[PDB]
Subunit: 363 residues, 4 copies
């Protein structure tokens, strides 16, 4: 089938003074013709400006740690968060066209003051403890393996209750929101509104009992009311899938590939309107079938060792390393040991708007 | 406002030979005129043929136990289940116009053979253990406080793995299904297809991790894929609600009234298309506000002591006792000690069809 | 596969004084055992008490006309409507277990006073004119071929603006509503609230422009806000389908079988929560493939000549004749001339509750 | 309340060699810190790079006409479409961050060859006739006042059947699709696949009968199957609203302001997943209340004379003139004569993702 390089170009006008005058009037009148731009504007398949890229956790940690020494956290700058900037996205602090990802660092006894914004956000922890994030006044402990949510427009601030630093990753729909013009922002309290440090938040104490819904929470929500998806449950779910597979029972998405989607328990859908969160566990030796998927995804290695292949290029990966797969880039994971990864993506956007497509090798 | 007793009856024809001949032709031609039937067919508010009624657990147990002595369980009759028959429903084995409820009794080492039917069903246990119910080949342990589901068209049979008898209650949409003509039925295996007795079923091992969904289970279901809602989770959820109330935090539906709805985790909706299951826990001294609700509900006392008021009549209640509240009958619960009750209803039917109405005293 | 007649009956207790005493205690305690009732309560496939039956329009007209002479219309009896009573439904004025159908007759200058009720209702006209039905104060002309709606809880009354009588058919969910206990009813004005007789109602003037929705009507409704589905549109739609078929283009449901569903334009779904309305037009010679469908349906012949086959029995049909197909009864239509039929059913109930099943001969 | 200009900037590190070295390592490692970017990335309310702007139809026509003389239409460039480029969007052929708008010109007997692409598209006509657009093989006449749809992935080409030129406007989600990486594109036939010029398309002959749905079209669609929303219906709907207002009846969105939304008749929702189309008619003298709305909108004056106010600035408008209102820009319309406008927007994106907000003056 023809592409933009092989098709006949039948709209090539004669290069005369009249043509050049027409084209000068276009500039003056804020007009740009489709016929000179077609192939750029409307590619055969997606061709992102973002490139696949890997950031090493050892490098992220060094830069975050040095930032903890040299930059105080507080009002204005709001957070000591270091955004991952895709080399292909022109100097914008965007890991992909839709998503922001950052390593955030909070030192001994620091607080990061309360604010809210339309942009949706989550926190994920490969390692560490000591921080509580207070979401609409509800303190939520942050620990290794936990997904924490802060849906758009919820007040949130954080405090380190400890004499030891903690780091984690943030994901937000900042780049989508900046480009599409949906951002609103409000400064809240200079200190978190509750310094208490309970083991479990009020949201969890209501919503984290499997298959049960409070009669006071019968209205569905656009975002999950669960503030913490704790490691204990994620680990148990993934283990049970591999055990069910051992027993000859359906459960894994693919052979030796256990995986869950974190969900809004009021609907069974995605945690937030713009962001999908998953967790994958591959047995030693597993090699996933190559996928092309519309929209972008980011993974963080939680545990074990393995590799990612993107555009045919293998990169070895270790605990904490992060990678981005832009739209339609062919990708696969290869597990050396048992290989655990946290994943996020802009797939709820693509699916809501009927733009999603998937190609899987061998099917 | 006028009712059918106080309105003028302006369609009263002269009682002549011609009128009586007209009315005889109506009988011959299978015609029945609205004008002689209006008030019956279309009441001012619902007036059920079912009456409020209470069955004592001590009486249910005696009859079930004697049935265990005198009647063998097996093919044909299928189950040793004793249906609660509303005195107002003309000899039909219906607790309400929509619902069947029964005490079922399975003796030492008995099996009840496998079958399936379009009618949706659940099991609830106030006391006992030893039985496994095998649902589409997945053995599901039955224990005190557990809700077990068997959605329409799932093969199910049960076996007592023990030398001791067990009793439980069944709820089904049998009366709805019989009157509306939606019943299909298929005999399966004469013995259960798996005699293994695991602590937890495969359904639970996949689906009972709070806020997590397997990537192999991304299609929504019409009924919950959770085969067991275990007492441990229900008890914890209800306790946390009362604790949150202690802490000044929203959670209970009403003061001292904790309550959950069992839900399909794929949608956040009801367990099955025709049947809603809830569990309520009232602090000692709680008296619920009087409700009128369209459609019928049945409760079983799980624990504690208290009373129900129906149509203004108080009946004292004990562990295991069962009562039915027909459509639009005013009802309230009064808790003497801490008072725990399992509840089921036909409310998903009423709500699906936009017939639901609720009146709550003092609001 | 086994049925209830061929299965072994393994729950047959020894007929002793102790057994008979047990069974007497069951009666005293309002208990009815499943084992003596199983096959009745839970049939292999639906076996309705309703039977297929045909009512002749010439007979309906004679009885309605005589009723117009002998019975005045007004308060109390409310409407001069003659309900079609299924011979199998025990003297209940029910055409099926879910639906009421009636021929209603309004003589010269009569009014039928305003009321409302939870039961949903529609009017269909095989022939006649002169009546306006005033629905929540909006006068809606009634003419040949028109479907008129009156969703539950809308005030409605009717008046004949003419010196000539008119007859039509009513359909309601009266039998569903009576058996399920969802009926509420309120008397309104003794006269219609607006005697004006516009050609088109306000509802239609807002809602009957194809593919357009008023910005003041962006909230979805549970029932259609279109008060009249006029013959002109139904006829044009059916004709265009047969023309598209002539042109080799997809459109008809089956060869020579044009058909539409009347829909709620806010959702694209059924006109009312409990009732589905369709209109079918078959070319001369068309014989539809035999269907078994869960739930009941009623047709009225609008025009042309043909036959229905039910349970293998052929009945010839003429203009106005009405027939009922109970749940799971095999049925087919045979067209002698071009054959037009209006159809209603309880299918939205069956589909909402996941009870629908369909068997089509040759597929 | 604080904004980014008035808040204290508490994250200002000491400008030392160590800090500058840290910041150099950030560049080297593709890291950009939040603390230097916060206010840009996360504004108090949306602050688009797009600016309000007006393009005159007389200018668009001159440039399109000259393009018809100097540039041939055909393969490669695909369409002689002149995109409206927002002065604030850096040289991108985008009228807003989400939407493309263009004047397209097709001369006597020209054809524009068939292609398809994931990007959704529509055509609107302020004036002219003679072109047919062939959509998945179904020829759709284009005439004054018509909205034509071409949902993503439908093959489409166009041909002028006449010796006279025609111009119209195109709207697409090109800028959304380019930035979010969802574009796929396929070249089809070099000539349209059907040169026939029927008055009405097959889609319309099936789908444009108010409140009726073909039994062969019971599956819902993500986009409307109506290929043409003809002027006749839009005009009648708007007139009826103003008449109902005359009669004291609810209908208009605001006093003297009639308006419709073009809808997908299978769902009652928007025509396509990314684009909302409306048509407004204001009585002489009407001044709409000032709105701020999230996301962008574009209007074209269809008929009459009036003005738009954006950011407090009044611009007088005539037949065919086009304007863009970027996200959150305050806007109002003022009608001198009776004032008719076609409107499109990215609102289905904002609403699907829960980003929509609206401020209306005086409420
Ligand atoms: O609230 C946060 O911690 C936050 C973290 C980020 O990386 C970017 C924006 C934010 O608002
Ligand atoms: O499958 C059962 O245990 C069952 C129990 C009942 O009480 C009634 C019908 C049934 O099919
Ligand atoms: O309102 C009516 O015309 C009506 C007609 C019927 O056949 C039965 C009940 C009703 O309320
Ligand atoms: O198909 C079209 O006519 C078209 C028109 C545009 O203005 C831009 C892209 C397109 O594909
Ligand atoms: Fe934040
Ligand atoms: Fe059963
Ligand atoms: Fe009525
Ligand atoms: Fe195109």
């Amino acid at each position: 089938k023809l592409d933009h390089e092989s098709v006949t170009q039948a709209m090539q006008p004669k290069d005369t003074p009249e043509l050049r005058a027409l084209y000068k009037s276009f500039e003056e009148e804020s007009i740009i013709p489709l016929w000179t731009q077609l192939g750029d504007l409307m590619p055969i398949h997606p061709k992102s400006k973002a490139v696949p890229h890997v950031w090493k956790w050892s490098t992220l940690l060094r830069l975050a740690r040095k930032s903890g020494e040299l930059v105080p956290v507080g009002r204005g700058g709001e957070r000591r968060a270091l955004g991952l900037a895709n080399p292909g996205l022109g100097g914008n602090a965007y890991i992909s066209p839709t998503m922001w990802a950052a390593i955030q660092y909070l030192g001994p006894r620091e607080t990061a003051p309360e604010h809210r914004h339309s942009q949706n956000a989550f926190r994920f922890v490969v390692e560490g403890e000591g921080v509580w994030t207070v979401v609409n006044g509800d303190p939520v402990r942050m620990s290794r393996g936990d997904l924490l949510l802060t849906p758009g427009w919820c007040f949130h601030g954080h405090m380190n209750d400890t004499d030891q630093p903690m780091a984690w990753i943030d994901g937000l729909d900042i780049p989508f929101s900046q480009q599409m013009d949906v951002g609103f922002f409000e400064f809240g309290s200079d200190r978190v509104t509750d310094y208490a440090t309970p083991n479990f938040s009020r949201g969890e104490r209501l919503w984290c009992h499997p298959g049960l819904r409070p009669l006071s929470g019968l209205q569905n929500t656009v975002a999950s009311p669960i503030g913490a998806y704790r490691w204990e449950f994620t680990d148990r779910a993934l283990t049970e899938q591999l055990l069910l597979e051992d027993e000859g029972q359906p459960a894994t998405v693919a052979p030796g590939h256990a995986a869950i989607r974190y969900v809004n328990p009021t609907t069974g859908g995605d945690v937030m309107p713009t962001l999908r969160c998953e967790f994958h566990r591959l047995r030693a030796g597993t090699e996933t079938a190559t996928r092309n998927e519309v929209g972008s995804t980011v993974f963080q290695v939680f545990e074990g060792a393995g590799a990612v292949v993107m555009n045919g290029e293998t990169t070895k990966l270790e605990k904490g390393d992060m990678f981005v797969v832009p739209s339609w880039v062919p990708w696969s994971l290869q597990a050396e040991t048992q290989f655990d990864l946290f994943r996020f993506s802009d797939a709820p956007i693509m699916e809501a708007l009927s733009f999603m497509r998937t190609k899987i090798e061998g099917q």
